[PDB]
RNA sequence: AUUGAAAGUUCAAAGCUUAGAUACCCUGGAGGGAAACCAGACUUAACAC
């Protein structure tokens, strides 16, 4: 009982982790996969905005924040390494 | 009324004897127990005011 109330309390702020995509190339553009594939990359970067990870992120906890993005095939993704950047520095609220 | 008449190719007799469907021969080769999946959802009640 101590253990599991205990535990409760590793709360952290600020947890800072790195989220590597790797892409398995093999499976081909079969009927829509580039177009399916960016529209998969934009859902991330909506998750990473508009969400968080774990427990009750609808109240704000977990919530995500973006560091740092960097594309290795700007074939497909050079549209959301810029558009993320577009979050690097925030000045006002409107913006 | 004939170079005729008469005359059982018959009798006895084991397709038997010896003889190994045996000799050599890998159920083996190839093949990812993987694929997908949020430990998460939410506060409510009571009386006082």
Redesign the pocket.
Known sequence: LITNYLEYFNIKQEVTFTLNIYLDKSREHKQNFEDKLKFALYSLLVFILLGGI??????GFGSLSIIDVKCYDNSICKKIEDLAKNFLKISSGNE
């Open positions: 774990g427990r009750k992120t609808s109240r």
